[PDB]
Amino acid sequence: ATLPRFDLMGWDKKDIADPYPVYRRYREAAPVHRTASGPGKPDTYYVFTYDDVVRVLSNRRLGRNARVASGDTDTAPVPIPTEHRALRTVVENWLVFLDPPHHTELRSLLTTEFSPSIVTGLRPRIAELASALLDRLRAQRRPDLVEGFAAPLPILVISALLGIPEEDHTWLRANAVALQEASTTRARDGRGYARAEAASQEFTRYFRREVDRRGGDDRDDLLTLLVRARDTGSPLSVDGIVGTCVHLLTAGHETTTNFLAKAVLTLRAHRDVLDELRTTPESTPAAVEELMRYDPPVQAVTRWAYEDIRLGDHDIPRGSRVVALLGSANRDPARFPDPDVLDVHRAAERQVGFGLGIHYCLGATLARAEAEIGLRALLDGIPALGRGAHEVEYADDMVFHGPTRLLLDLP
Ligand code: HEM
Ligand SMILES: O=C(O)c1[nH]c(C(=O)O)c(-c2c[nH]c3ccccc23)c1-c1c[nH]c2ccccc12
Ligand SMILES: O=C(O)c1[nH]c(C(=O)O)c(-c2c[nH]c3ccccc23)c1-c1c[nH]c2ccccc12
Ligand SMILES: O=C(O)c1[nH]c(C(=O)O)c(-c2c[nH]c3ccccc23)c1-c1c[nH]c2ccccc12
């Protein structure tokens, strides 16, 4: 052989920031690579090719539950230790980790609230939010584009849909970050899990509070929608509602946050595109799409084999974990010529940054709206966005991929 075993763990900051050279070396050797774990831990098959990633997200014998895959009561349905019960409850209640029919019933109840029509009515306001955020960020000397903008924008947006207090955007953010340490490609040397556990509890109480208050002066916000469904007979527990709010809050902003932050990083490394964008704003929609293919906010998603499946050079046994490398698929030259070139005129609707299949990003249209309106705000409100120095720290995360913070030195 030539290449050693591949996994998303313990990577140095250099590779986390620019993982593409790694996906390339592996993609060129084989579309699928398998990595053995050692005990009663199942093998994992990493998919690097576009076509095979498509197959991972599409084939229905791949599911989200490792317990269903192994047919073993002992194995955890989701990747969180039993020790952490509040965390486990919250996570196994996320739509992304559900299988049909439960998954179908929930998405169905939820999708009407994120329609193209509703996103269009939201734009003028997503615009005043960004403007106000940037307005505030000039008041300070070395602004953090993440805490001061990339995070607050999508949190305030989803907070309104949910029907929660705008004033809680900082509290919401910190608990979402604490919970993120439970993500499967994190360090977790010392209390990542304990913190995520406590965060989960904070969200449980916060959201349990919100619903016992859903006999009030009755709005329409996901919360009410959710509570009214249960009250009228829908198969929904308060844990399920709680988990959904947590899922919508986290999945509803951490992704957009990373897109916005990394987009600033990408445009800075591609000044011709950045300057082209500053002068011709009609290119914004095409830029977003290409920025997404170029450096997707979500680098890896997992699935579990419910039955034997053949992919690439491998015969994946039932019970095997399967990882679709979105970032690697978006830079596969077989699908995107000159993949490392940031070209905003290429056809990129093909990119799998929003996923594919039944779990296709639920807020894609909302995400796209926050992305263009978002980076528009940055482009027009910060002339020196592409000048001067910047400092960034990437999170040790290969699922939700991006900066923990990004300070700029334009006064
Ligand atoms: C530009 C930012 C965003 C990106 C890159 C993104 C990306 C993704 C990806 C790749 C998945 C699939 C994961 C898998 O197959 O395991 C996903 C799922 C999901 N996203 Fe997004 N997302 C973004 C914004 C949003 C927003 C603003 C919301 C609004 C609440 C949202 C809600 C969801 C939900 C609910 C799911 C799970 C749906 C299901 O399992 O059927 N996302 N997202
Ligand atoms: O048990 C689960 O529900 C699970 N779900 C996932 C996932 O990523 O969806 C994992 C997992 C996360 N990282 C892994 C590496 C090798 C094998 C499994 C995993 C696991 C997992 C972690 N440790 C395990 C030990 C035995 C069986 C499954 C897992
Ligand atoms: O940690 C993982 O391995 C993972 N895998 C996925 C996936 O969808 O395959 C997620 C995940 C959870 N919500 C998501 C929204 C968009 C994209 C990915 C996710 C996650 C994930 C993100 N944050 C987490 C916190 C706790 C447990 C899992 C995740
Ligand atoms: O200049 C500041 O006030 C500052 N404050 C911090 C901080 O961490 O609070 C930094 C800084 C230094 N190294 C960092 C890495 C990631 C994020 C921020 C930094 C910096 C910083 C050092 N060099 C810079 C260049 C551009 C922007 C900020 C900084």
Domains, the chain, ordered by start: 1-411 (1.10.630.10)
How far is Cα 320 from Cα 307, in angstroms, rounded to an integer? 9
Nearest-CA neighbor of 246 among 150, 186, 181, 162?
162
Give the ligand with the smallest distance to the CA of 141.
4
Experimentally, the structure was elucidated by X-ray
* For residue 235, cis peptide bond before it (omega within 30 degrees of 0): no
d(CA 158, CA 152): 10
Phi then psi dihedrals of residue 390, to 5 deg: -145, 155
Q: Which of 408, 378, 153 is nearest to 284 (CA)?
A: 378
Q: What is the largest CA-CA distance in the chain?
A: 67
- The annotation status of 362 as a binding-site residue, yes or no, is yes
Please state, in angstroms and rounded to a whole number, the distance separating the CA atoms of residues 248 and 244. Answer: 6
What the block records as the tokens of 247 is 């899922």
Binding residue per annotation — 195?
Answer: no
Pairing of strands 301-305, 32-35: unpaired
Contacts within 8 Å (CB) and 24+ apart, 171-176: 172/249, 173/147, 173/253, 175/199, 175/202, 175/203, 176/249, 176/250, 176/253, 176/254
* Helix (H/G/I), strand (E/B), else coil: 305: strand
Q: What are phi and psi of 393, to 5 degrees?
A: -135, 120
- Amino acid found at 121: G
The protein residue whose alpha carbon is closest to atom 12 in ligand 1 is: 355
Element (H, E) at 315: strand 314-316
Q: How far is 46 from 26, CA to CA, in rounded Å?
A: 10
Q: Which two structure tokens, joined as six digits, stand for 176? A: 């979402």
Alpha helices in 137-185 (DSSP H): 152-162, 169-180
Q: Is the CB of 8 within 6 Å of ligand 2?
A: no
Does residue 102 have a known ligand-binding role?
A: no
Going by the DSSP 8-state scheme, the letter that residue 404 receives in this structure is E
Question: Which residue type is seen at 326?
Answer: L
The residue whose two tokens read 């807020």 is 363
What is the number of alpha carbons within 13 Å of residue 47 lying toward its C-beta? 28
Please provide residue 403's backbone torsions phi and psi, each rounded to the nearest 5 degrees: -60, 140
The pair of three-digit structure tokens given for residue 194, joined into one six-digit string: 């304990």
Eight-state DSSP code of residue 378: H
What's the 61 CA to ligand 1 centre distance in angstroms?
Answer: 21
Determine whether the shortest distance from the Cβ of 44 to ligand 2 is under 6 A: yes
Q: Report how far ligand 2's centroid is from the alpha carbon of 182 (Å).
A: 12
Give residue 206 CA to ligand 1 midpoint distance, Å: 23
* Residue 371 Cα to ligand 4 middle (Å): 25
User: How far apart are alpha carbons 338 and 355 in whole angstroms?
Assistant: 22
Cα angle 59, 60, 61; round to 5? 95
For tokens 């293919």, the residue is 293
Does the C-beta of 293 come closer than 6 Å to ligand 1?
no
Measured distance CA(245)–CA(249) in Å, rounded = 6
Residue 232 has which token pair?
A: 């009228």
* Residue 33 β-bridge partners: 46
> 60 alpha carbon to ligand 3 midpoint, in Å?
19
Query: Is the Cβ–Cβ distance between 74 and 313 less than 8 Å?
Result: no
Could you tell me the resolution of this structure in angstroms?
2.4
37 CB near ligand 2 (under 6 Å): yes
> Looking at this protein, which amino acid is placed at residue 3?
L
Ligand 2 pocket check for 63: Cβ under 6 Å: no
**Considering only CA atoms, which of 202, 216, 214 is closest in space to residue 249?**
202
Other CB atoms within 10 Å distance of the CB of residue 236: 18
Query: Nearest to residue 333, comparing CAs of 324, 323, 341, 325?
Result: 341
Question: Residue 302: CB within 6 Å of ligand 3?
Answer: yes
Does the annotation list 186 as a binding residue? no
Q: Tokens for 101?
A: 């029919």
CA–CA dist 17, 32 (Å, integer): 23
From the list 372, 379, 405, the residue with the least C-alpha distance to 390 is 405
92-114 as b/e: b if 16+ CB within 10 A:
bbbbbbbbeeebeebbebbeebb
* Alpha carbon distance, N-terminus to C-terminus of the chain: 53
Q: Annotated binding residue at 245?
A: no
- Is the beta carbon of 298 within 6 A of some atom in ligand 1? yes
Ligand 1 center–CA 173 separation, angstroms: 17
Nearest CA-CA partner of 157 in 257, 224, 296? 257
Closest CA to 220 of 212, 230, 228: 228
> What's the CA gap between 213 and 227, in Å, rounded?
10
CB 341, CB 347: distance < 8 Å: no
Rg value, the chain, Cα:
21
Phi, psi (deg, nearest 5) at residue 57: -75, -10
Q: How far is residue 45's CA from residue 325's CA, in Å, rounded to a whole number?
A: 10
C-alpha to C-alpha distance for 63 and 41, rounded to whole angstroms = 18
Residue in 161, 222, 299, 362 to alter for ligand 1 test, most ligand atoms within 8 A of Cβ: 362
Q: What is the DSSP letter of 41?
A: P
Other C-beta atoms closer than 10 Å to the C-beta of 341 total 11
Measured in degrees and rounded to the nearest 5, phi and psi for residue 144 equal -105, 110
What's the token pair of residue 1? 């052989």
Tokens encoding 39: 């005990």
Rounded to an integer, what distance in angstroms lies between the CA atom of residue 205 and that of residue 201?
Answer: 6
